[PDB]
Amino acid sequence: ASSAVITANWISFLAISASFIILLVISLRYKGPGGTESFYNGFKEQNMLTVFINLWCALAYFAKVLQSHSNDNGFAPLTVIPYVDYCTTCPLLTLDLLWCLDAPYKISSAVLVFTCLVIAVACSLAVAPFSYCWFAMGMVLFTFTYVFILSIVRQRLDFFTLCARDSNAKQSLKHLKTAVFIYFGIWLLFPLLWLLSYRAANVISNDINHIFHCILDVIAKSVYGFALLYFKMYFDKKLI
Amino acid sequence: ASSAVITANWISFLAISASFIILLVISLRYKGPGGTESFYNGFKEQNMLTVFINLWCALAYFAKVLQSHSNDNGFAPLTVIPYVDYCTTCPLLTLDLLWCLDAPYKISSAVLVFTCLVIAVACSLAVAPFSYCWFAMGMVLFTFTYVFILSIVRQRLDFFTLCARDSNAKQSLKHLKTAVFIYFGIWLLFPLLWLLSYRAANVISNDINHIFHCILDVIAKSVYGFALLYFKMYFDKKLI
Amino acid sequence: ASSAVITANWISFLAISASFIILLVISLRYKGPGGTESFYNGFKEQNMLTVFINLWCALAYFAKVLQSHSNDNGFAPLTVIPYVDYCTTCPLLTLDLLWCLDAPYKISSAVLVFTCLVIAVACSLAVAPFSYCWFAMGMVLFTFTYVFILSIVRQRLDFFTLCARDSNAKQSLKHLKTAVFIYFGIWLLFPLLWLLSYRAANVISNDINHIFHCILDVIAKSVYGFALLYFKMYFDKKLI
Ligand SMILES: *C/C=C(C)/C=C/C=C(C)/C=C/C1=C(C)CCCC1(C)C
Ligand SMILES: *C/C=C(C)/C=C/C=C(C)/C=C/C1=C(C)CCCC1(C)C
Ligand SMILES: *C/C=C(C)/C=C/C=C(C)/C=C/C1=C(C)CCCC1(C)C
């Protein structure tokens, strides 16, 4: 691979590894809002989802780094077949988002995201013009899923803001809004990147697409999980 | 493919898509027995299983439609490898059946169905005479699973009928019996179709086998889910 | 295959099949500590995990037996790709271990074991020297997971021993300690077997590695599940 590609892969792998190790340490050392439960997150494993996500992401990028130094394909599921790592991760991200917010249809939303990602995987491994049909079907399903998840997220954000008066509550709400903006705005770029890649309109080269994918992953995973975590720890739920 | 095959694929895809969209609309608009919960199914995601099943089925058939118009294989998992779509769907159907009935060993029954379907997948990709051994092992496992699930279903049906006196309760019980008959009688045809296909006794041609599979899927998914849904909404549980 | 390989495969398959059928019969006939619940394990499906594990293991070995009598590869997922059967089974074993002990991070520990096994699968299908890097990463992850799971297991064993005074309680504690020793000591042999196989230091031939793998599987599944089961049935929890 090119110098830029290998450098971006190494930087992304190191960033996600550091983020995974910090998140795991914070989760293990977290003692709950009361500061008395030794294994608060042990009996509430959903709070660990973020951590696992990062770990998986890190592993994927690790494979990429190996593929960056060898002429032969590395771990095919995480390097060869596109969007499989996303198939594994994004549903967990949606489940965590709708769990911290106590939103309805968390499992349904996660399954919809997984189905959209599998449709995208089929589209990326298809041949035109059938690839166009697969992309159109995925686009309709993702539009429906996006509208549904926004409607739930907006209604939970309004509910949370209605009963948030403490300064710490306001700071946690700002972090939650930042995480929500990262989740919604950034996710819309992935379809734009696919439609702008060598597939369909070929304008952006492979290297720039890969670097943009790496940057979007790093942001929307590391910063997203950190913000979610700031919000979960520093937002009193009993204010409901 | 032949005109009959493509016509059957299109009809099945349209029927399952319409069934998925109607079931999703009904589930989203359903407000619970009391008619006061805005997200009754949101906090009870098992009631959405049916919907997801149909959606997945629809997607599978969509792939078939694409494979029906191209000389190259489409989405291999849903078109090339047989029974993989069934591997994904049937365990969910069993889980939903044993959940609406509040039956024991729902997860165990789903795992048994998944194991039987994986054994069938191995059998379909094997070479004789090892295919015969795989089929025999799958037949013993499926016989055990069928006897166990019938025994649970019959005992829950007797329990439900013991305390069902309302006219609406009787109508819901009739729909539940129709769904149970569809689940049990129709499922016995799939092994008969496999034993009658080009594998083992080659009497029925590929096209007729495909059309019969499409009809059985459409019935035992669309009508089955509609009946289950009639039963879940229009059967007061508090009569226990 | 050689006479020794086929004999070991047949013996392992028969042992695991007999163990699965005895465990399933005991679980179905078990009526709970009170001896009044007809479906005690039906509403507590975690107690069935062991059974399912054995069944899956049995199926895997069945495939091996077929591969032992044909020049062509059998069910590739359970015979060709190494550690995939382990990917399916070991996480369930860890989940069951941490569930019977009411240990924290049971799902987290299961996901860590699954990630370690997937890393091992990637390592076994890699090419040197990238295989060495994959093995090193898997070794660090497994060391962390081993230390974490030991720390949880030791703390739950101390907790259980603190309030175990009955003779039957002592007998169940002895069986639990035997199961824990099987889980910890035996698992350390698998990495030693991999490091001693044709990969890395080639000293032990393939046949001896296969026989050792079969013996370790048989012990650490059949005897492990039987001990876990002796402990779950014959240990009064109300003594907490
Ligand atoms: C950490 C990585 C994440 C959250 C990746 C998310 C990716 C998507 C939401 C992708 C969506 C796509 C479509 C809606 C259309 C088809 C192309 C995709 C896969 C880019
Ligand atoms: C919606 C589709 C469904 C419910 C399909 C179900 C299929 C089966 C129950 C198939 C069973 C089989 C056997 C018991 C023996 C081996 C051959 C099979 C796969 C047809
Ligand atoms: C029933 C079979 C079981 C429990 C198998 C367990 C296997 C392991 C814990 C294997 C671990 C390995 C490593 C930690 C390093 C890489 C090589 C492995 C897969 C042998």
Three-state DSSP string of A186-228: HHCHHHHHHHHCCCCCCCCCHHHHHHHHHHHHHHHHHHHHHHH
DSSP 3-state assignment of B81?
Answer: coil
Handedness of CA A116, A12, A153, A89 (dihedral sign): positive
Measured CA to CA, the distance from residue C193 to residue C190 in angstroms comes to 5
Greatest pairwise CA separation for chain B in angstroms: 60
Whether residue A169 contacts residue A182, with contact meaning beta carbons closer than 8 Å, is answered with: no
List the Cα angle A91/A97/A102 in 5-degree steps. Answer: 120
Measured CA to CA, the distance from residue A21 to residue A27 in angstroms comes to 10
Measured CA to CA, the distance from residue A226 to residue A224 in angstroms comes to 6
For residue C83 the two structure tokens come to 């550690």
Domain residues for the domain of B83 are 3-239
Residue C123, C-beta contacts closer than 8 angstroms, at least 6 positions apart: C131, C134, C135, C138
| B59 phi-psi bin (left φ>0, alpha ψ -120 to 50, beta other) | alpha
- Residues of A whose CB is below 8 A from C119: 59
- Looking at this protein, which amino acid is placed at residue A143? T
Measured CA to CA, the distance from residue C20 to residue C25 in angstroms comes to 9
Using the structure block, give the residue that is written with the tokens 């060898």: A70
Measured CA to CA, the distance from residue C1 to residue A187 in angstroms comes to 52
Residue C110, C-beta contacts closer than 8 angstroms, at least 6 positions apart: C91, C92, C94, C95, C98
DSSP codes, C206-227 = HHHHHHHHHHHHHIIIIIHHHH
Q: How was this structure determined?
A: cryo-EM
Question: Which value, in Å, is the radius of gyration of the alpha carbons in chain C?
Answer: 19
Measured CA to CA, the distance from residue C97 to residue C89 in angstroms comes to 13
- Among B167, B173, B182, B239, which Cα is nearest to B216's? B182
Whether residue A94 contacts residue A149, with contact meaning beta carbons closer than 8 Å, is answered with: yes
First to last CA, chain B: 53
Residue A43, C-beta contacts closer than 8 angstroms, at least 6 positions apart: A37, C104
For residue C82 the two structure tokens come to 């190494």
- Among A190, A108, A111, which Cα is nearest to A152's? A108
Whether residue C3 contacts residue C210, with contact meaning beta carbons closer than 8 Å, is answered with: no
The pocket around ligand 2, CB under 6 angstroms, is made up of B 83, 86, 89-90, 93, 116, 120, 123, 138-139, 142, 187, 190-191, 194, 217, 220-221
- Among A191, A183, A190, A188, which Cα is nearest to A214's? A190
Measured CA to CA, the distance from residue A182 to residue A197 in angstroms comes to 22
User: C84 CA to middle of ligand 1, Å?
Assistant: 28
Distance from CA of B207 to the nearest CA of C (A): 27
- Among A79, A58, A106, which Cα is nearest to A225's? A58
Assign residue A234 the CATH number of its domain. 1.20.1070.10
- Among B14, B42, B17, B12, which Cα is nearest to B27's? B42
Measured CA to CA, the distance from residue A92 to residue A48 in angstroms comes to 11
- Residues of C whose CB is below 8 A from A59: 115, 118-119, 137
Mutate to test the interface with C, among B99, B105, B148 (most CBs of C within 10 A): B105
User: B50 CA to middle of ligand 2, Å?
Assistant: 18
Surface of A (183-202) touching B: CB under 8 A: none
Using the structure block, give the residue that is written with the tokens 């204010």: A239
Whether residue A125 contacts residue A110, with contact meaning beta carbons closer than 8 Å, is answered with: no
- Among B25, B24, B30, which Cα is nearest to B53's? B24
Measured CA to CA, the distance from residue A181 to residue A162 in angstroms comes to 19
Whether residue C232 contacts residue C100, with contact meaning beta carbons closer than 8 Å, is answered with: yes
Other C-beta atoms lying within 10 Å of the C-beta of residue C140: 11
- Among A73, A63, A80, A83, which Cα is nearest to A10's? A63
- Among C202, A112, A214, A78, which Cα is nearest to B56's? A112
- Residues of B whose CB is below 8 A from C69: 130
Whether residue B134 contacts residue B141, with contact meaning beta carbons closer than 8 Å, is answered with: no
Q: After which residues is chain C broken (C to N over 2.5 A)?
A: none
For residue C14 the two structure tokens come to 């028969």
- Residues of C whose CB is below 8 A from B127: 70, 72
Measured CA to CA, the distance from residue A237 to residue A166 in angstroms comes to 12
User: A124 CA to middle of ligand 2, Å?
Assistant: 30
For residue C167 the two structure tokens come to 């003779």
Q: Is A138 exposed, middle or buried (0-12, 13-18, 19+ CB in 10 A)?
A: buried
Residue A194, C-beta contacts closer than 8 angstroms, at least 6 positions apart: A120, A124, A135, A200
Measured CA to CA, the distance from residue C240 to residue B207 in angstroms comes to 64
CA A99 to chain centroid = 14
For residue C237 the two structure tokens come to 């929890």
Using the structure block, give the residue that is written with the tokens 């490091």: C195
Measured CA to CA, the distance from residue C52 to residue B143 in angstroms comes to 17
Number of domains into which chain A is organized? 1
Using the structure block, give the residue that is written with the tokens 């069902």: B164
- Looking at this protein, which amino acid is placed at residue B28? L
Measured CA to CA, the distance from residue A20 to residue A22 in angstroms comes to 6
Mutate to test the interface with A, among B50, B75, B88 (most CBs of A within 10 A): B75
Q: How long is chain C?
A: 240
Other C-beta atoms lying within 10 Å of the C-beta of residue B213: 18
* CA distance readout (Å), C56 to A135, B78, C61: 37, 24, 9
DSSP 3-state assignment of B158?
Answer: helix
Other C-beta atoms lying within 10 Å of the C-beta of residue A102: 13
